Amino acid sequence: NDRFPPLEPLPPAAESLPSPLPERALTSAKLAALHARLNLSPKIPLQTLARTLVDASADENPQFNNANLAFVGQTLINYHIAEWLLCKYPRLPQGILFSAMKAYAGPKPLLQIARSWGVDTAAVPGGEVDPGLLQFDALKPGVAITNFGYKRTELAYLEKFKWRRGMASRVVLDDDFGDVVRSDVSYDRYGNPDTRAAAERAHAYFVRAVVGAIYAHCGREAAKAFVKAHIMSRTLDIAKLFEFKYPTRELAALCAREDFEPPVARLLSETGRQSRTPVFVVGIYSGSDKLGEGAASSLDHARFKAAMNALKAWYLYSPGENPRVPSDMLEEGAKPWTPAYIDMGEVISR
Amino acid sequence: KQVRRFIPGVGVQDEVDFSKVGAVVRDGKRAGDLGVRTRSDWEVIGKMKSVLPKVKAL
Amino acid sequence: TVKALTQISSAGRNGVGAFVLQCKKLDIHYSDWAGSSRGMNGFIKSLLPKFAAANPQIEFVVSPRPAKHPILMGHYINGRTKAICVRNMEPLEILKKAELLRDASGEKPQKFKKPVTSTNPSVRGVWSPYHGQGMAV
Amino acid sequence: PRRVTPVDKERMVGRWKVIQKELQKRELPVLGTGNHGKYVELKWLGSK
Amino acid sequence: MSQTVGATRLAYSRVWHHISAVTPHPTLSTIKAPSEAITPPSLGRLASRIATILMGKHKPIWDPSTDCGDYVVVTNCAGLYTTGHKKWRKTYYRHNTRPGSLQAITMDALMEKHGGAEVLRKAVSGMLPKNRLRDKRLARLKAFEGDAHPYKENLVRFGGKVVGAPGWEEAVKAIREADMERL
Amino acid sequence: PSQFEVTKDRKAIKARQSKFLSGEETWAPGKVNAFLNSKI
Amino acid sequence: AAVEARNEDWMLGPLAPRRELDEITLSNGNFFGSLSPTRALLESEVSEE
Amino acid sequence: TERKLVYKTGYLPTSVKKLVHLSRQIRGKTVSEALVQMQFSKKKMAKEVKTELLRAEAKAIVTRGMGLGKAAAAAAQKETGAEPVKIQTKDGKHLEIRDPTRIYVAETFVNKGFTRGVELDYRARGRVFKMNKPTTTMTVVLKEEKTRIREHQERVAKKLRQGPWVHLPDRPVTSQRQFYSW
Amino acid sequence: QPPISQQVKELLPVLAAQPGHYTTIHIHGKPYLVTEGDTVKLPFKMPGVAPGDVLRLNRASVIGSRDLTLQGAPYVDERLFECRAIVMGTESEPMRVMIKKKRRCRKKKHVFSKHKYTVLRINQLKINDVSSL
Amino acid sequence: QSTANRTKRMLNIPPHESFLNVPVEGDRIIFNPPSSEASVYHTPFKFLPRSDPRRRANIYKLFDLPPVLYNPTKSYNVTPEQVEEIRELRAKDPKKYSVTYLSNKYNCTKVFIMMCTQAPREHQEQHKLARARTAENWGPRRAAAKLDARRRKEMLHRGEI
RNA sequence: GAUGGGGUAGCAGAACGUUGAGUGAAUCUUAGAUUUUUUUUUUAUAACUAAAUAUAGAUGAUAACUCAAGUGAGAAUGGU
Ligand SMILES: [K+]
Ligand SMILES: [Mg+2]
Ligand SMILES: [Mg+2]
Ligand SMILES: [Mg+2]
Ligand SMILES: [Mg+2]
């Protein structure tokens, strides 16, 4: 009214648009602060950083939306992480290589990366909101980013009748993280487990787009440094992603494959036998060498725990903490490439 | 390495990296004098629609 | 047979690889009628223009608030907020308080107990009686 | 230029336009007390 | 904080140590020469070493509040070593609060009823902190008169050799050499 | 309380209790507790 | 009583009590939704002012 | 989802220290079990608590619509041969709830009201003391058996969430030193 | 500059090759055992540092791994290692009140204390290759 | 104690003996093998690729085995023809020719008999019910102690124990 | 790279708070003034942020400076 003039001058036909106009991004203090917070180069204008916040659920148009920036960005993150993970841990099983990829570039960590940048989400997408807010519609689930994975013919039978899928096929048919492909309005309601996932998906697409926008404007090297700084800088204990079934059987198959003599469990030290909380320290030996050590309260648990540590040591072998990656060659002249160790695959046993 | 700092007595003192060594303190009565990126600087960057990274870099 | 657990995600370490200033917004509420806002009005005219230019990663929002003391309310990335009442303070005192909001984090104040805080394991594992030379009572 | 009220913040977030519809749908006042009058039960009894 | 981030399981585990009250102790003996004169650890000098184990003060993670103590099996308590004429001249007193009811008994008369293990429990008890953990710690002192005890399988071992046995030290050095064959 | 004479309001709530328990009538939420615009 | 009756309706929803079938309030002896003769006829003497 | 009735009784001519023991006897019991204990109690206020507990149940059924599914519930038990629900109260008492709509005494406390009167105690040496005749009220919170079946499932889930007992727990070393002691 | 010992020149590559490394830095003489990624909370307000400054620590008494430990007599030579931190702002404590009082004296004198603390973040801890030295 | 500083001194523990022999007039590197459990990132030399140059003599070299606990032996006493008899008997009378009877008859491990043959579905469901009826006679104290033994075995394989 | 730092009787300086008053026919308030609470932050006997509950347009509240005091209570076998 007369006492309360509008704070932001906007035309009358602005609350109906799916998202704010491009020129609106040049007068918001949230974007200019979000641009300087991430130390983005001046090559990336504010109109491009404003397009990385408009999800595909708030605007259906191919342009004005984050759908195509998120795709190009997802490819860079998923690629730079995979090559770094294989060069660091060249023996990781395929199953754990998907959970480690998902632990770094998955929707969950990206959601924490988006929240670590001070990005506030918008209530409902509209042209009136300032472009500095992540705007999406969690109610609409008809949004899906194009993935290189294909749909499985037995998907219907897979979920209903619990058909077997297999790991070797997930590299081609499934998505990058091994997941299966294709797995008025009243706001008087509460949050839903689907909206919780849709909101998380929106944050993930924004972080990917920021890497895609950096690539288009600043080039390849700038994008790699961004992924290396914000995503790869995170810490993850890969040893905790291991779940074993009959480890003793797997260790025997490993020793049999590598020609190591049969493993023998030996009681290194013990105390408090015939007590409530005994301790049995057992070490599995291949001849004279000591493969793994395990200390538990039960004689059997100590032998199982020791077998897992022997397997973890094999799969978690790392040539170096900061190893060279194949991508270092395509850039400016660097040292000649040296062949990297290539493991022969995880052990399959009974 | 220091970051951009505003000194009340002197003025804004730009970031300096002593590893590659420069304490430049720009004082004035207009945003342009301070040496920071203003709204006008952000509008000339948004009108450079022809700039593009070289294909080899991309 | 190794099965991967899909309930563990990486943890971010601000300052490693990249640094993000926690203070993402700063509200500056003044009053044209209140006498206690005399210094804040001077800080907004002589010290805020330069303090806002030196911190381009902070969203400054200056809005009036008549019939109320002036406050500096900073919003942080972790969702928490810190508000400081600068009633009857001189301009340079407002800048010393605005510097406290920038250098501070949203975390609640805590007593000094331990200097170092680590999430990575020990380079030398924790002491174990059974992995040593033995002890004879 | 003026004080930022809870209504202005809702507009920035986008929620305001959603509130206008629900309040108008339920015939509730938007930025007013409505056409209802003040409490007159005690007034009619001679309350001072 | 890294130094204490890890598995603390085995640091808080209860170790079952063993010592004989008759075996000469070159460290806890006051006669250090000649080799044939080295005596066993006296009552109070053995008790002071045991009270340190019951408190877990020999560990680098010791905390007075946490009960990080260990077990101690003391054998051959019938031949408990004592100097002077303590055995027949030291008196233990007891009162029940009722005037007249003072009970006195000599060390030798207290070793005829409850053996030498009771004389050792009284010494270790008075060397422990007087608090709510004194009875838990003192309960982990399993003292026996002879060489027989039910914890011959609980005693800490290294390579099958009980600590204090003839060849336990060599069995420990052999396990640490194989430990060095790793990055 | 046990000696207070039962008024007409307490004699009416004892007949309703026998009608609901028996099954003649079916209980339904009140509609005149308050005149809200939401009507929910 | 209406400040508390409007909060139970909003909250209880389908379980809202049938207050009209409740006993009288011993404070005044009025049934639910009923006034008193002195307050329905306005027979209470008022001041000269 | 859960019905509830908070009923404040009338002014009883007794004290809190006398009626407190009668409100703790009916706590947790069903309205039926409580009415059988007040009919056979030697206390003079058990007859007043029995009439005030029948009024609460009359309002719990007419206004809140509690305990109106016995006929429907009895069917599933016998017509379909269903296994009734077995729960355990917070105190540990085991129950077998065949009718989830059965009314029971969830909470109950006693408050003190106005002073009934004042009697004068004339002692020796011409001394007079005022004796206050007390007057207390009781408040009972009647709920259905669905509240007890829900509170039990929560307690069972809270016990299955604390994990099992491990032999060698990883207790923390809560002391920092700028060196390694091992 | 004094040449490094030959015994240190043959075992440093073995020390840097192991998986993990720790160091005991000395700020104003006080030690702090840290690792790459740790967050040091100094018990004082470092003057002249803003959130975002990068420091270069040069006084390290011990740089060691699991089995190998490099100890300098006064300190380890700066050329062998490289440690850097980054200022993460300053933090404060809850105001604690001390009441100074004597028996049979009504006066209770109050002391209000609220100190600030600078928070660092060890972002780099690497052992240099000394083949050239 | 009165203050936090006094509590720190009473709870003091000195550093290891090796860290007390500080050098003089130079820097040195000492061999300090800690008395602790090594992690899984210290790969043994047997698991290192031949190309990896990090393989090297023990650090000690730069300056009998313990008792057996489990040494199994594999035996193959069942010929292919005997595997067809196992499938006939098991499917003919699953109650008389249990996996224990056939395990003893053919001198085999009870597991192997199940690898080559399985009992009929009806007999299997009868086995799951027998154990289910035994799990309903347990009280609340024994049914919770058995559920912990099943979770401690699942936590062990997840690296949590 | 200023100097100084316990305190009774006692002396001295500097401030906060409370009640009323002037500027005040002023300022602000259903876009929520005021709400004995809780909560948050700030060198902090004080105020402030937010939340919850209720509903006032002045017989409401109030910054700042100033004026005047029936102005600050674990202590009087104190009084109600
Ligand atoms: K309030
Ligand atoms: Mg008389
Ligand atoms: Mg002094
Ligand atoms: Mg008094
Ligand atoms: Mg009195």
Side-chain angles (χ1 to χ4, degrees), chain I residues 8 30-31 34 36 67 73-74 78 84 87 103-105 109 114 127 132:
Chain I
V8 173
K30 308 288 170 52
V34 301
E36 187 177 304
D67 286 89
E78 305 178 31
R84 288 186 172 74
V87 187
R103 287 173 180 280
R104 292 163 289 279
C105 174
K109 209 185 80 171
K114 187 168 179 177
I127 304 167
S132 54

Side-chain angles (χ1 to χ4, degrees), chain I residues 37-78:
Chain I
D38 286 6
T39 305
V40 188
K41 178 172 173 179
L42 304 169
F44 68 96
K45 202 198 175 303
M46 189 177 290
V49 289
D53 292 11
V54 182
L55 314 176
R56 181 168 50 78
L57 320 182
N58 50 32
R59 294 282 168 283
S61 186
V62 168
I63 287 97
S65 65
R66 172 169 179 76
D67 286 89
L68 292 164
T69 310
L70 164 56
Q71 317 176 340
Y75 286 117
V76 173
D77 179 15
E78 305 178 31

Side-chain angles (χ1 to χ4, degrees), chain G residues 13-28:
Chain G
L15 303 190
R18 296 197 62 162
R19 289 183 150 104
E20 64 274 2
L21 311 174
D22 196 334
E23 296 163 2
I24 61 183
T25 83
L26 279 293
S27 57
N28 38 36

Side-chain angles (χ1 to χ4, degrees), chain A residues 26-92:
Chain A
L26 218 58
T27 189
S28 88
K30 270 191 167 56
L31 269 173
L34 181 59
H35 201 286
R37 191 172 305 123
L38 316 173
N39 277 16
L40 298 180
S41 84
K43 294 178 183 175
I44 300 164
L46 288 182
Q47 285 83 336
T48 292
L49 179 64
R51 173 166 157 177
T52 71
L53 291 154
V54 184
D55 211 74
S57 48
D59 208 331
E60 285 59 22
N61 206 41
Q63 326 188 217
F64 300 113
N65 93 0
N66 218 4
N68 289 332
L69 293 170
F71 180 89
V72 171
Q74 172 170 357
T75 311
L76 300 173
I77 301 175
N78 275 218
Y79 164 78
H80 285 105
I81 295 284
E83 65 175 21
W84 163 66
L85 227 50
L86 285 171
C87 288
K88 196 175 183 182
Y89 304 102
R91 284 180 174 167
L92 276 179

Side-chain angles (χ1 to χ4, degrees), chain C:
Chain C
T1 313
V2 184
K3 300 176 188 174
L5 296 168
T6 78
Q7 283 277 269
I8 300 104
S9 282
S10 47
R13 311 132 86 193
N14 183 24
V16 188
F19 179 72
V20 173
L21 188 74
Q22 295 304 286
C23 195
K24 79 191 187 192
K25 194 188 166 181
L26 188 72
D27 273 327
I28 308 166
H29 300 303
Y30 68 93
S31 180
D32 271 316
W33 162 83
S36 48
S37 192
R38 256 198 299 287
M40 177 63 108
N41 299 15
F43 156 82
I44 294 167
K45 289 186 306 201
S46 54
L47 301 170
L48 180 61
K50 294 184 175 182
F51 179 79
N55 306 265
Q57 58 268 328
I58 305 183
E59 173 188 5
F60 301 86
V61 180
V62 191
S63 72
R65 210 145 159 269
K68 216 130 185 61
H69 287 306
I71 59 165
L72 292 165
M73 173 145 49
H75 311 252
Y76 299 93
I77 279 167
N78 67 354
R80 284 189 82 267
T81 286
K82 300 180 63 165
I84 311 177
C85 190
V86 307
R87 59 166 185 162
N88 297 312
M89 287 188 189
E90 268 42 76
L92 284 164
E93 286 180 315
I94 320 301
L95 189 68
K96 220 196 168 195
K97 245 67 189 183
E99 277 190 41
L100 184 156
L101 293 166
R102 170 194 63 136
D103 314 329
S105 173
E107 312 291 17
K108 303 181 94 290
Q110 80 202 145
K111 183 176 171 172
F112 184 87
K113 291 278 191 61
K114 293 161 172 47
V116 186
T117 305
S118 161
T119 81
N120 45 30
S122 327
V123 179
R124 335 175 83 244
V126 183
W127 177 83
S128 184
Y130 323 96
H131 294 88
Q133 257 198 309
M135 184 195 76
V137 154

Side-chain angles (χ1 to χ4, degrees), chain H residues 94 159-167 170 174-182, chain J residues 8 11-16 19 34-36 140 147-149 151-152 155 160-161:
Chain H
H94 300 253
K159 221 169 184 66
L160 185 45
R161 166 158 31 84
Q162 289 177 353
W165 165 86
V166 295
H167 300 75
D170 261 303
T174 58
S175 199
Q176 191 156 102
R177 301 176 188 85
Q178 311 306 335
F179 46 70
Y180 270 104
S181 312
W182 44 89
Chain J
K8 205 198 163 201
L11 305 173
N12 189 49
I13 293 170
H16 195 235
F19 293 104
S35 84
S36 48
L147 174 56
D148 288 359
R151 291 152 81 192
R152 287 194 227 100
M155 292 173 65
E160 300 164 21
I161 280 176

Side-chain angles (χ1 to χ4, degrees), chain A residues 50 53 75 93 101 103-104 107 109 248 312 330 344:
Chain A
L53 291 154
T75 311
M101 278 276 290
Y104 275 105
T248 57
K312 289 190 187 195
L330 42 66
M344 65 191 302

Side-chain angles (χ1 to χ4, degrees), chain A residues 83-90 228 232 316-325 340-341, chain E residues 183, chain I residues 16-21, chain J residues 41 43 48-49 52-54:
Chain A
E83 65 175 21
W84 163 66
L85 227 50
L86 285 171
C87 288
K88 196 175 183 182
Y89 304 102
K228 204 164 173 53
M232 288 169 54
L316 294 176
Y317 153 79
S318 162
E321 186 76 341
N322 295 307
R324 288 187 71 191
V325 291
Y341 177 71
Chain E
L183 288 181
Chain I
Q18 270 188 309
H21 305 100
Chain J
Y41 299 94
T43 310
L48 294 173
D52 196 349
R54 284 180 303 167

